[PDB]
Amino acid sequence: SHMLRLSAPGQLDDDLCLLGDVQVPVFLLRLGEASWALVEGGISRDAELVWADLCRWVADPSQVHYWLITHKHYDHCGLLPYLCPRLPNVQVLASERTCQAWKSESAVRVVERLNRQLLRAEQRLPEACAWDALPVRAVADGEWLELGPRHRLQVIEAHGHSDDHVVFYDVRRRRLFCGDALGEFDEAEGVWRPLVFDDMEAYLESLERLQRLPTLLQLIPGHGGLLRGRLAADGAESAYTECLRLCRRLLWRQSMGESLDELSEELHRAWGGQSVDFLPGELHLGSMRRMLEILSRQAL
Ligand SMILES: CC[C@](C)(CNC(=O)Nc1ccc(C(=O)Nc2nccs2)cc1)N1CCOCC1
Ligand SMILES: [Fe+3]
Numbered sequence: 289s290h291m292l293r294l295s296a297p298g299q300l301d302d303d304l305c306l307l308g309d310v311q312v313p314v315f316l317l318r319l320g321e322a323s324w325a326l327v328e329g330g331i332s333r334d335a336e337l338v339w340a341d342l343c344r345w346v347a348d349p350s351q352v353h354y355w356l357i358t359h360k361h362y363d364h365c366g367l368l369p370y371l372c373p374r375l376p377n378v379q380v381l382a383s384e385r386t387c388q389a390w391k392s393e394s395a396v397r398v399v400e401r402l403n404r405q406l407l408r409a410e411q412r413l414p415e416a417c418a419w420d421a422l423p424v425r426a427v428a429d430g431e432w433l434e435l436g437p438r439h440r441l442q443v444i445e446a447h448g449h450s451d452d453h454v455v456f457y458d459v460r461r462r463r464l465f466c467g468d469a470l471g472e473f474d475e476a477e478g479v480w481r482p483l484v485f486d487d488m489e490a491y492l493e494s495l496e497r498l499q500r501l502p503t504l505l506q507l508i509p510g511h512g513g514l515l516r517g518r519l520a521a522d523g524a525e526s527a528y529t530e531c532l533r534l535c536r537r538l539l540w541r542q543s544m545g546e547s548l549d550e551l552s553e554e555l556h557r558a559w560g561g562q563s564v565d566f567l568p569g570e571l572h573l574g575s576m577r578r579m580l581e582i583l584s585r586q587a588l
């Protein structure tokens with residue numbers, strides 16, 4: 289593997305561990321002698337794996353006090369109903385629009401269906417509390433999250449991947465939990481693959497704003513581990529560049545009379561392998577289709 293990417297479970301930094309699977313990770317922050325936080329909310333089927341990992345670092349789970357959520361997609365909040373009942377003192381921190389999703393009977397329905405397609409036939413889930421009963425506290429754009437004496441993270445709105453997406457910036461550590469706002473990091477090639485599933489202008493505008501942060505040392509997306517060195521410092525600029533590259537490519541093929549379905553199958557072919565173990569079959573191709581439709585509307 290590559291020294292600019294930390295992609296193994298376990299300790300990542302003095303205060304930081306990766307729990308569960310690197311492809312859909314949950315990050316553990318040590319806030320103090322008896323205080324911890326989680327960041328990112330995973331897929332439901334990983335409940336017992338993430339729990340087992342957690343208990344290796346946290347002897348008393350009533351010490352997990354915060355759980356930070358970047359956005360409402362099924363692969364970023366699927367653990368909450370299954371692990372929150374095991375964390376009696378936790379407070380889920382999420383944006384207003386993310387919290388709204390969990391009160392929508394129809395939105396919750398899709399999160400559950402997508403997660404249940406990932407269950408192995410062997411396993412059943414733990415007893416879950418209701419989605420509208422999660423211990424949540426809505427956070428707003430620009431709010432400072434005073435998690436502990438050495439952990440202060442700023443909430444930054446970063447719409448475009450989804451209409452609710454936020455990121456969390458630890459300025460003391462030049463550390464950005466960026467969710468899917470920069471896209472999907474390509475592990476074989478070292479570049480970002482765009483994930484524009486709501487609004488292209490918002491996605492680009494968010495990346496512009498994130499480039500203005502003080503130089504990053506650690507960049508932690510929703511999938512694939514921790515990026516450092518030049519990958520963190522240039523991440524938001526590079527993600528912006530790769531989005532434009534995809535737009536140009538789409539414009540090029542359309543101008544040769546190609547249907548969106550052509551570049552869609554090509555993109556699914558080139559990029560679908562990374563997420564095949566947590567993104568159900570037709571969903572990735574459908575996702576590529578939806579992205580190209582969004583790019584095509586906001587550029588033709
Ligand atoms: C809570 C609201 C929600 C249930 C959210 N829906 C999802 O979570 N869908 C979803 C679909 C595709 C990807 C995807 O392609 N991920 C990738 N990761 C890597 C490469 S592509 C991720 C998530 N709504 C939204 C639409 O209305 C009804 C359902
Ligand atoms: Fe997402």
Ligand SMILES: [Fe+3]
Pocket residue numbers: 361363364468510511
């Ligand atoms: Fe995701």
